[PDB]
Ligand binder design. Structure first.
Ligand SMILES: Nc1ncnc2c1ncn2[C@@H]1O[C@H](COP(=O)(O)OP(=O)(O)OP(=O)(O)O)[C@@H](O)[C@H]1O
Ligand SMILES: Nc1ncnc2c1ncn2[C@@H]1O[C@H](COP(=O)(O)OP(=O)(O)OP(=O)(O)O)[C@@H](O)[C@H]1O
Ligand SMILES: Nc1ncnc2c1ncn2[C@@H]1O[C@H](COP(=O)(O)OP(=O)(O)OP(=O)(O)O)[C@@H](O)[C@H]1O
Ligand SMILES: Nc1ncnc2c1ncn2[C@@H]1O[C@H](COP(=O)(O)OP(=O)(O)OP(=O)(O)O)[C@@H](O)[C@H]1O
Ligand SMILES: Nc1ncnc2c1ncn2[C@@H]1O[C@H](COP(=O)(O)OP(=O)(O)OP(=O)(O)O)[C@@H](O)[C@H]1O
Ligand SMILES: Nc1ncnc2c1ncn2[C@@H]1O[C@H](COP(=O)(O)OP(=O)(O)OP(=O)(O)O)[C@@H](O)[C@H]1O
Ligand SMILES: [K+]
Ligand SMILES: [K+]
Ligand SMILES: [K+]
Ligand SMILES: [Mg+2]
Ligand SMILES: [Mg+2]
Ligand SMILES: [Mg+2]
Lengths: 489, 7, 489, 489, 7, 7, 7
């Protein structure tokens, strides 16, 4: 993006001042759309010395004579040339600037425009910058951030000591990673993305995307009228144990609710009987085990079962002990079908197996599972899209790293999912998503496409729950999937 | 809202 | 039908020109009903040299002076006498005909009337005929087909190399088989059937019918107020195995949801317990088996159980191995009750057994099962209503050949079902229909009547699903059956 | 305004390129507000070589990659520096320009953006400019004009041989006189006025204004609760004759319907009796005349009557003969009250009388009356605001020059009224407005203020007529005045 | 009304 | 209408 | 729609 500004100025010939004018007026229009008529509000515009501040001077200048009061607090030392030009315009237009900030200054204003730092933030915020941000955060005023809330690193979404909490953020061209990943996603408040005149070619060249409704709509598989269940594929789910009898049921129904033609579960006897007593549409094959867990004794039956399917999901509720490790790794090594690898199958996975497989795989860890898989801490892997990309690329797989914002990558293309709510922060949620992904693969979507559509729909179904999200359970999530699908179309 | 347009 | 034209002209004395005028004006009225006022549209009428083309010249002539523009492209070589007469009228009325088609010609018109070929299509479409049809199919214009979309064989519904995809088809007298079977059903778009003046006696003499709401309404059994469960019959379902525990439950509830008085399942222990934990209204008798599958050891218990019922359904989830084959065939040979034979009972059926049974039977295969039963390929049996009829007649049974259009025949009468959607393209759907058919037989409908009502209602229930059809499962299908019934009345 | 651009660039320091970017994007936003989503439309942008054209290149460039198609036809010879810069951007962004216009070019586009000439039009339009404008006018496409429809002189509203008829005009900063006066007002279609970043001080410095609802609302006199009729003033209307008995009634009720406390008419006997038989709230004093017309014999009674009033209206229906001339001029010369001088009192007015009066006057001619008053042709006075201003200034009066756009001036301040419709193009309309103006003067508004409020409300009342405007009569106009008043508040 | 058309 | 803003 | 009938 600063690349995209650079090219638009130096190669396309757009004056930097024209980009900055367009940025500032976008902020004014955005605020009007959110607050209604601006003429009754008093504005405090906080401007740094850089281009974000310059954008702020444009805002301030365009509000002059049209709103109740505007004051700029200039917080920088030096001014970049465009900031200086726009400062000069603000003052020529009769605008007032002060350079000292007084704690009681918030009292006489209704709206704070935060133009302190944009994408040029380097290092922790301290001093008067911090004191001022902390005062704005305690003020209860309406806060509109220019580009990114000051204090958010726009590459990672991390807070650099302290950051503005905005009601509205207006960003330019494309959303930044810092609006998409937490905590930055939370501090952004409502995000508007403004067109400030970059060539469309440069906007579309970005390689990291937010999954949108239109993207998912266009990926949904067709349902030709002259069809039968075989048209819509077959899934095998290898799942469950004497300890975890529920997981298979949720995965299997996740596949059926997204349109899959046939779903077979392989589950240890008698736990397999649990699935059909709840959903008799499922096929739940009884696997005879020594002690209630899959082991190498079951390798051959599972491979036979896999021959008549298009995709295999493995892992939910398997347990994690040595015989399961041996089974999972020997199975995946021999299986010549796409695999969706989740939960306990991740916890015992030998990643060498993934390198040697000719067939594709999708892995769906939460950060605790990812952390154990790459031998790092949760803090080092959480929202670490570059680590996810490296892992996907090295192991020839799709990685779906689950969290409130989910990252979906094959190492070349990375997508971010922002649907969902905290009702998914509960056992069983993950098991449903596993079945969904397998189901869409069976219907003919690529592993990456299936993962993209599934994470979106899974989160969207959650948002459709009619009561308080904390009461959402996986069973109700399932009931909501076909409504998410209908609403998407 | 009338920042941009009067009619 | 061309028979019906022939008789109406030669025996009843209706001038062929009067039939052709009536056909053409039907098309104009149909288009007005679908597009609203025609006066703002420009029409491109593509006419072959036969009677379909003649119908087109009638259309073109009746639009002259009333719409924005009409042009006929005459694509044939010679003209039949009625086509020639109507061509002559079109020109006397001031109409324009060209004989060369130019790719850019579509550009100046809004609606294409396809009067190239009707039921007189013989062989693959090639040359300028094909090129023109392919251009119309790429054009995005509104396409109205006269009689049948050109390129569909009206006897089978197959595409003869290439065919017009219509938004609206107007056919004369009765629907043709090619509007009812796929792919032709898909290419027809919305079908209107116009009365063009054939004697009603000849229209009603057709032996192949589309199942309609009024037909099903009039077949539904009465529910006398002074009744009890015995009034509404008793069904035994012999179903399931250690591998397939869910199938019995779906079949049994399919019988209860259509109004059957009592349903008993015979299912291997402990899989029988699955049914009553989900629906405690069912009676689920435990059958003690050696290895989880019905065998000759269970022959005598099953025959005892059958004595107190009106109908027996057999096959869903039985498995297919030698002991099941022996059991199914020995059972059906001895059973002196109507039988509904599905799924795995079809896969092991010895068809000699059907010939020797005195009691009736309904068989409900999908095309894969039909193909294995007559030792043909799926492609040779799919939508092959003449093969279905032969099989029904030779084996003294009702054959219900399932697909997006379902064929129901006893060898003398053949019916086509067009209710349903792709949510039924999923495991469990078939199991429900089996129970429905048995249930209606138990209520006193003939095997053919029971099959007719059941296929219609089963498809209609699917269309009543409130969310996206791909999320429909058999359990939800069941909940919808009583609403399908209510809506039918 | 070109002054206002000049100052904003040279004194305030706003780059001319920034003004031009802001102008162009205003056009895009305006079009979106009027057409909805622009992405399905194809745009033909016609650009001259000047700043209007430059604005067009900004429009074209901002539509690239976002709508179905954009093409610029560049119609000029040379390009000004900002036009050249924006042309260069359009092409760097991948935009297509042609320099030849082909009559069939309109066929492939939905919207024509007219950026040929703005306020820099000098002289009659001929050649390819004319041919192209005439083609656009015959095309039936949606036409959006940048700044002013090309061919309208923005100072007068006159057509310079030929001009674009726009559906939408987007102008910058303030409306131009050419959008306000006919024919230009008609060719403008819907007018949007965009803020392109001029300092508010310069926008407000304009001395010619369109009368707006907010202006009239803020001018309306207060109605203190503790009041009586004397609070709201007293009007004398000297009006009518044996020939014209209706005029007094309409003037008098015009004063009462705007809130005046007391209205007295002086009308020749027995024509005075007409007024009270219709509206018995009026006082209609009988004036004894020799032959049915006011003459010097009535001078003294009229002056006595004027002593107890705040304002005198004179002229409606007086007739125009020598004795009326003598009376009107001797009356106005001696009357030391504000006078509203209309109709026949204008036709006999000696303008020397206006110079010698110490008291104020408002004159309310239509262009035929103005033309006879200054001894010019109707064509020379119609919409001639500079002539109106000179006349007001020389004669120390307010001039209200009536037409579809009414001009109200005291020589220093000029206002334009754009309310009303063709139902006011009928005898009696003028008589009502006369009474309204007198009434508001009596309530304490200045002559200019009273005229400003009255012309607005008079036109607005007309627009409130519930049936076809051509059926509006003065009597119904009267009934509508209090609803116009209510709606204004 | 269904004299002309069945659907 | 989405020329200016995406959400 | 007025192909057949005027009133
Ligand atoms: N952590 C910090 N503490 C104090 N000052 C800082 C800090 N980070 C950045 N700044 C100052 O703010 C300036 C920002 O200017 P610059 O135009 O590079 O970025 P910006 O204002 O974020 O604009 P843009 O979003 O276009 O990059 C920096 O150059 C630096 O001098
Ligand atoms: N606050 C949240 N917002 C959005 N999505 C969430 C939130 N919390 C959890 N999720 C989603 O719910 C799913 C949780 O799956 P995960 O495997 O991480 O937890 P789980 O309890 O193990 O589920 P399961 O018991 O089925 O294995 C993931 O898709 C994750 O992205
Ligand atoms: N596959 C084909 N390729 C080229 N021409 C064909 C093809 N099939 C049929 N035709 C021509 O179109 C003619 C159709 O005339 P005919 O009246 O027999 O049938 P029709 O136009 O379909 O009318 P109807 O529907 O009443 O039978 C045929 O006789 C033949 O000459
Ligand atoms: N696209 C469709 N449109 C209409 N009906 C359909 C469609 N796809 C399937 N069906 C219907 O659904 C039922 C499928 O039964 P079938 O036995 O063929 O499949 P199944 O998966 O074996 O069901 P089960 O698992 O119960 O045996 C049939 O009645 C068939 O006609
Ligand atoms: N009547 C005409 N016939 C042909 N060309 C003309 C005519 N009138 C003006 N032009 C050309 O169009 C140019 C307009 O350029 P200029 O920037 O002065 O005015 P504009 O394009 O109307 O912009 P603005 O509205 O800012 O004044 C003129 O300088 C002239 O060369
Ligand atoms: N088309 C129109 N649009 C708006 N206002 C109009 C229109 N035609 C006439 N008017 C208004 O109606 C009034 C006509 O008064 P005028 O004295 O010109 O005509 P009139 O017939 O003499 O009325 P009267 O008979 O009362 O003297 C004026 O205010 C004029 O501005
Ligand atoms: K900021
Ligand atoms: K045809
Ligand atoms: K113009
Ligand atoms: Mg999990
Ligand atoms: Mg089946
Ligand atoms: Mg008049």
């Amino acid at each position: 993006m600063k690349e995209i500004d650079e090219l638009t100025i130096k190669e396309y010939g757009v004056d930097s001042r024209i980009l900055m004018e367009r940025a500032g007026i976008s902020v004014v229009l955005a605020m009007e759309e959110e607050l209604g008529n601006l003429s009754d509000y008093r504005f405090l515009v906080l401007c740094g010395g850089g281009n974000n501040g310059g954008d702020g001077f444009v805002v301030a200048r365009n509000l002059l004579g049209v709103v109740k009061d505007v004051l700029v607090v200039f917080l920088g030392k030096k001014k970049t040339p465009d900031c200086e030009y726009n400062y000069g315009l603000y003052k020529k237009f009769g605008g007032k600037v002060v350079e000292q900030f007084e704690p009681s200054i918030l009292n006489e204003f209704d709206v704070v425009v935060d133009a302190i730092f944009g994408t040029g933030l380097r290092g922790e915020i301290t001093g008067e910058y911090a004191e001022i941000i902390n005062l704005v955060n305690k003020s209860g005023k309406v806060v509109v951030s220019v580009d990114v809330p000051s204090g958010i690193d726009s590459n990672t979404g991390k807070v650099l000591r302290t950051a503005v909490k905005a009601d509205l953020t207006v960003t330019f061209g494309v959303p930044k990673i810092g609006h998409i990943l937490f905590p930055g996603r939370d501090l952004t408040g409502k995000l508007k993305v403004a067109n400030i005149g970059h060539p469309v070619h440069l906007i579309n060249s970005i390689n990291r995307y937010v999954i949108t409704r239109e993207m998912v709509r266009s990926l949904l598989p067709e349902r030709p009228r002259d069809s039968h269940k075989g048209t819509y594929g077959k899934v095998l789910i290898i799942a469950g144990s004497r300890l975890y009898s529920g997981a298979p049921v949720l995965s299997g129904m996740g596949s059926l609710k997204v349109g899959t033609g046939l779903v077979k579960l392989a589950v240890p006897f008698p736990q397999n009987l649990i699935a059909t007593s709840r959903f008799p549409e499922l096929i739940s094959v009884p696997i005879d085990t020594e002690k209630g867990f899959f082991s190498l004794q079951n390798l051959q039956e599972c491979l036979e079962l896999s021959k008549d399917v298009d995709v295999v999901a493995i892992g939910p509720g398997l347990g994690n002990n040595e015989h399961v490790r041996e089974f999972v790794n020997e199975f995946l090594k021999t299986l010549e079908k796409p695999a969706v690898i989740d939960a306990d199958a991740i916890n015992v996975l030998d990643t060498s197996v993934l390198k040697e497989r000719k067939s594709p795989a999708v892995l769906t860890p939460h950060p605790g599972e990812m952390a154990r898989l790459v031998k790092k801490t949760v803090g080092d892997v959480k929202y670490n899209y570059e680590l996810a990309e490296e892992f996907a690329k090295e192991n020839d797989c799709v990685l779906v790293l689950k969290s409130a914002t989910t990252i979906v990558t094959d190492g070349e293309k990375t997508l971010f999912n922002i649907t969902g709510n905290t009702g998914l922060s509960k056992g069983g949620s993950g098991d449903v998503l596993t079945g969904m992904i397998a189901g869409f693969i069976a219907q003919g979507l690529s592993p990456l496409e299936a993962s993209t559509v599934s994470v979106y729909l899974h989160g969207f179904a959650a948002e459709l729950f009619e009561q308080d999200e904390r009461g959402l359970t996986a069973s109700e999530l399932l009931r909501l999937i076909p409504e998410a699908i209908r609403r998407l179309k | 809202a009338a920042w941009l347009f009067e009619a």
